[PDB]
Chains A and B, each alone.
Chain A
Amino acid sequence: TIKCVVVGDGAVGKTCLLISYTTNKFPSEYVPTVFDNYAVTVMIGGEPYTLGLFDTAGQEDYDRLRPLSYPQTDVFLVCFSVVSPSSFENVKEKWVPEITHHCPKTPFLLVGTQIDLRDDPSTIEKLAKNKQKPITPETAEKLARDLKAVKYVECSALTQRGLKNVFDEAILAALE
């Protein structure tokens, strides 16, 4: 069993990508739930691997409760919304330094989420009003190198684009 922990700012899409991956469908707004500790078994090259999925949502603003989830973690998922730049800044300013402190031997991926809103005209308008632009993959891949992340991945819990790939690359990182 490989323990994977998803961390990142609030409302970046941590819970959704976990639900959308495990339930193979994006959470309906009318039927919303939390994400209990879940275990999935995927097949990579004929070899079954078991992921231990953990959701740190609701802990972001609690510094003594957050690291309780960190013990025995095999791989981290540092998340940021490609639309929210402030969540992208807290990656190098908060989350990556925090997991390096608690779990220095634990590998982590750089996960860009909500990539389906990057082309959305309505969303760019709101970002333009604050003189901000959505994080391009080229930008995020630069942060992936500078923070010594294993690699960079993008996903949409809504479109399921590159969603499977995120957890697949997560496993490969925990087998290093």
Chain B
Amino acid sequence: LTPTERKRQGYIHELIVTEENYVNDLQLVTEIFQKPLMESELLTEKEVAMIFVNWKELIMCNIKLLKALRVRKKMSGELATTLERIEKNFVITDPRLPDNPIIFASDSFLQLTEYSREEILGRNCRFLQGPETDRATVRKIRDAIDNQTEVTVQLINYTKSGKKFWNLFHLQPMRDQKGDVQYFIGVQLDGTEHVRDAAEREGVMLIKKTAENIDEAAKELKMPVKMIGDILSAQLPHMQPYIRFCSRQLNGAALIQQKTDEAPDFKEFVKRLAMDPRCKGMPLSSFILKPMQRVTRYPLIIKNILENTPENHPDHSHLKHALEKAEELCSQVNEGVREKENSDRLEWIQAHVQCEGLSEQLVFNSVTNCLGPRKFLHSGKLYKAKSNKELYGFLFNDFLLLTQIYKMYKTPIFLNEVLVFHISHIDRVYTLRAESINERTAWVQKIKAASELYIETEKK
């Protein structure tokens, strides 16, 4: 096993194992946190929905994924228990995989060759060959594989230790219903000499009949497929509920923290729920991170599976497309957090700011002139020098709105004609006092950044 291919088997293992633990962790929260809190009646139905939100929808979303990953591993388990009734020396190889690796080795083959199944799977059967092995006979086996036809030859093979033995070897393809070759069956009949006449004729019939049983006992069974990207590439586009969860999970964490401080009964109640040994000593709040942590760790896993998957591997075409779809999901979720917060801020402003003395009806949550959707940036208490009027400003990406504790103060100051504490608009010069130096830093840095963004975009 090459170090590269060994890492691949390890990262594919990581994907499924961590998925098992993740789906289980989702179900733990529902069992010992969500359902108890729903009955506790310390939170209203709305308050519970503000915390766990579509947790249930995330579980069904990943179970469908988990079952798909399990079926693939189950194929090798159901097959092994089926081909266990055949106590003969045989291996099964996958031509569609690089260098035609052994995807299955019988128990009898391992006893004869003195090899373990872990030292064999994923390698070409050429390791059985040695010094006295007739290279001319070996090329007869190669041709039959390239020609996709059966063959039966006799050649010297060696064990793990080096014990010599003649091998009455029979090879035959395993075609599907469509007619294409998908697998190869290799039956070994160990001996001590090169069998001839009646001894050979009998042996040839035996191994050929053996291969016929293997082809039938393993037929109509969807064979173990050594790839995992095909599933991920088709399952990840359905991870939409993650966009919804993470966008609203922040309000939920702040809801619990609030309920925790202003109610000592609530804090102790939740802590007792976390005393479940299944929690490994972790609080409820940390479990909320797991859905966000899972999507961000999907590209990390897939990327490592991909970088240990060769170009000529049929999984490379899928893993590459899956990693693209995985990274899209994170971005959509990442932006989903930004969009939900933005809407929450703007809708709050829409029904709290009175717009009088204005020509057009100002809709905050709408489209700007050249920047698209309007974005809230900063807002804080602002005192006007030489007047000391209690003002309050809402900074956006396109303009600055000055209000008063909300009734509008003046005409909405656009940022394509604003300058940078001292803030300058065309001729008019505004002098505004900040509450602190750090807040004066926050305003200046954000106003200048938003102003320059407007200008450069307008200069196109």
Contacts and interface: CB of A to CB of B under 8 A. Distances in A.
> Which interface class (under 10, 10 to 19, 20 to 34, 35 or more) fits B?
35 or more
A176 interface: no
A12 to B, nearest CB: 14
Nearest to A104: B438
Contacts of B10: 29-32
B357 interface: no
B257 A71 contact: yes
Interface string A42-68: 000000001010110111001111001
Contacts of A52: 282-283, 286
Contacts, number: 87
A62 B289 contact: no
A136 interface: no
Contact of A34 (B3, B14, B249): B14
A65 B246 contact: yes
B182 to A, nearest CB: 29
Given A52-B286, A62-B330, 6 more contacts: A36-B18, A36-B25, A37-B282, A58-B299, A64-B335, A65-B333
Nearest to A28: B10
> Which interface class (under 10, 10 to 19, 20 to 34, 35 or more) fits A?
20 to 34
Contact of A32 (B7, B21, B333, B337): B7
A39 B280 contact: yes
Nearest to B330: A62
B250 A58 contact: no
Given A30-B10, A33-B18, A71-B253, A62 B334 contact: yes
A59 B308 CA distance: 23
B292 interface: yes
A86 interface: no
B368 interface: no
Nearest to A37: B286
Nearest to A3: B286
B300 interface: yes
A1 interface: yes
B289 A38 contact: no
A30 B6 contact: yes
A58 B297 contact: yes
19 contacts: A1-B281, A29-B7, A30-B7, A30-B10, A33-B18, A34-B297, A36-B293, A37-B287, A38-B280, A39-B280, A39-B281, A58-B293, A59-B296, A64-B341, A65-B246, A65-B292, A65-B330, A71-B285, A72-B257
